[PDB]
Design a protein around this ligand. Structure first.
Ligand SMILES: N[C@@H](CCC(=O)N[C@@H](CS)C(=O)NCC(=O)O)C(=O)O
Ligand SMILES: N[C@@H](CCC(=O)N[C@@H](CS)C(=O)NCC(=O)O)C(=O)O
Ligand SMILES: [Ca+2]
Ligand SMILES: [Ca+2]
Ligand SMILES: [Ca+2]
Ligand SMILES: [Ca+2]
Lengths: 197, 197
């Protein structure tokens, strides 16, 4: 199992986090997004990282790669068993993609306008502030893939110059609990370690 | 279990198709998208159909509702068991959402420009034509949720005035097999029956 990963890419960071939580054998191949190999576009028509390859299986889209990993290496389970909680969690993932990570892509785009990036930074702070009230982990008292998907953004709040309301103290205490997890620390690249303490 | 559904909505059509394939008890509530009730926006911040409600669970986003239904009423299974085929299928679903159903939303938007709708219609024909070569059903010899997600678009090719290449004959023969399924026919509203024979 091989992950093609960008060393500062938050979407690759999600997949690295899952891989270290499962603890199985895998290889990471670093891709410089400023100098992509031609085979990246053969694996992924969007020409982005992350990509996962295992034998004849090729996946892109970080949350889809992570679903696969969770099913492929069952234990420890990164999702609840209950179809109700799984559905609620999948919807939380979808809304984070559409309402938070769309802005993350703008901040990650070297070609985006300063004005666009300012709007994105603002929207992320506002979104996270509103989410802060809504348990130990996002779905309840158990760590899940939903926490995994959000963690690279919370790691990057200083990097992105995102400012949260004082009401968001609970979200920041939560983020510190995620960042203390052994696999979270293992998953950080040296470049991501440079983003905060 | 209650589905809030638009009578001509292809995304609602996907969920109706799943519900009739599972054969369990459910209720359909028809929502006129031109006269939405205020409670639609309380259930779904995007103020769209479909929405599924079951007790305290509220879901929107058709493919997420359908995942839930598949897990909630296990038999008959609408996905393969193999994590590899499930991952491949989830990626096919994601690419259909991003490359086909984005154009479907434009064709469904009364406010979209004629020029925008012409581009969407063109892109759907081109996309489907290219997909036509890539088995009895989309994932192989077994009917799946992936077939369910695509079927409302194929039902609507005449309605949308989408013209396919002659090379896409295999896709059209496939579409006829889907439309012969008992639950497909059960799932059609009278308005959708008016869209083709
Ligand atoms: N929806 C994708 C987003 C991946 C993405 O945005 N990757 C960025 C780096 S963090 C990338 O490869 N950028 C190069 C590009 O867009 O050309 C996912 O979740 O995997
Ligand atoms: N991504 C949604 C799309 C649903 C959608 O586009 N629904 C349309 C009708 S087919 C709707 O409610 N339109 C009203 C609106 O956008 O205001 C899903 O898959 O459920
Ligand atoms: Ca900073
Ligand atoms: Ca913090
Ligand atoms: Ca026609
Ligand atoms: Ca046909």
């Amino acid at each position: 199992m091989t992950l093609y990963s960008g060393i500062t890419c938050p979407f690759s960071h999600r997949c690295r986090f899952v891989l270290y939580e499962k603890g199985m054998d895998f290889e990471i191949k670093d891709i410089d997004i400023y100098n992509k190999p031609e085979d990246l576009a053969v694996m992924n028509p969007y020409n982005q990282v992350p990509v996962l390859v295992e034998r004849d299986l090729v996946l892109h889209e970080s949350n889809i790669i992570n679903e696969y990993i969770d099913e492929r290496f069952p234990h420890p389970q990164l999702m609840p068993g209950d179809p109700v909680m799984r559905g609620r969690g999948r919807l939380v993932l979808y809304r984070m993609e559409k309402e938070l990570f769309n802005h993350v892509q703008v901040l990650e785009n070297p070609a985006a306008a300063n004005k666009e990036q300012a709007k994105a930074r603002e929207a992320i702070g506002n979104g996270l502030t509103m989410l802060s009230p809504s348990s130990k982990y996002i779905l309840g008292e158990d760590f899940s893939m939903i926490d995994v998907a959000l963690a690279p953004l919370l790691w990057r709040l200083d990097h992105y110059d995102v400012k949260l309301g004082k009401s968001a103290a609970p979200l920041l205490k939560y983020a510190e609990r995620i960042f203390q997890r052994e696999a979270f620390i293992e998953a950080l690249t040296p470049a991501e370690k440079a983003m905060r303490k």
